[PDB]
């Protein structure tokens, strides 16, 4: 296997605007097929990248900054990854659309799966409205990320490399003196399988392919043999002996991580998907499912000279391998101090979400289920509805709802709601057999409130097997057509995604 910790961690450059005034910031990003070396000992890898980069450029904006991004497709007309033609039914093979994950975004700028476009916008999906996306950023400072969201192609386009970080800075938070600038570093974690010739491997069929299956065939999960951070296999980062802020983004298709430091040191979590937690939380380890973000401080002050591995204990299709996927990256505390560490790790970060006293307009009960197709494949479904079925999740703008998510399946699903961030209420175990047999919900234990990590704002939430998860969301400020889905991309594409109409009656 590839030698761990021989390549320095890339830090994506921050994107520069094409045009910028005090009223408007205008960006252009072009999707390009390019080649990049992912490891010292590999031939360069063919990839799809925003501005030809993997990950894409980091975009930095201020809260309320009036931002526009013209996301353009200049990709080849044929994919290099295996397309399953059976999962969706002239129309180009390669379709793309950029979704700003966590963006408080008007619906036609949200990257609707059917708002896709081919090269130079030559063909467009039935929900396409505009070339230049509008991000008003009227929302909390937070770690967002952008990625492809095209109908039936998301797992492939993202795996190809179409991911990048987007950071909203709220000037009100500068007073907290969190590590900033060089000491504030995104970590986009993506697992990959890479061939000896350096080409990406993505399976064209399940491991034991029934002759019933089409070819290629979608698979229900993907687990990469190797872990990359910021587009390099098992990299090292030289750090100064002081506090750093890391924006930890899980940009992987399926894989969930459970992260810790191999010296037993702590993380300080300061933020979740929707922004700063009310209070900082000291943690030894944390779970990170696809699309989840952890805003953390790591204090290297007392660890000068040391090599510390960011370790992973979560398996993917099996137990972790100590030599491979148990490793993420390596910090080397050997960079001389550029100046005094004037950063802080404050306890008091933000207003509590519980300060809000909104009326519960509606309680939605939603089940995570599915069926089997003509080929014997699992088709994962939200409420046993297909994507194309008439919309059922129709919250009213400006109203608050409780969603009760029932998971009678064998695994966890990271459920993502577009537009909004929500509060986690509780989780409660139930009798799976009883529910499967009769549709009756019989709890086998008391409700458990969220851990401190989940006492802030979330947008992607782990709904564990055999539990009912309750969340509360205020739907707004925009009305329109959005989506909610499982963020396991292999699930999302077949067919664990539903329209969400935020209505203005
Ligand atoms: Cu997403
Ligand atoms: Cu999203
Ligand atoms: Cu799922
Ligand atoms: Cu999405
Ligand atoms: O998403």
Curated annotation (Swiss-Prot):
Residues at which Cu cation 4 binds: 413, 486, 491, 496
Residues carrying the site annotation Plays a crucial role in the protonation steps: 110, 492
Annotated positions binding Cu cation 3: 149, 418, 485
Cofactor binding, per record: Binds 4 copper ions per subunit. The 4 copper centers adopt structures classified as type 1, type 2 and type 3.
Disruption phenotype: Disruption of the gene does not prevent spore formation, but mutant is blocked in the appearance of the brown pigment characteristic of colonies of wild-type sporulating cells.
Any Pfam family hit: Cu-oxidase_3
Protein name stated in the entry: Laccase
Species the sequence originates in: Bacillus subtilis (strain 168)
Gene of this entry: cotA
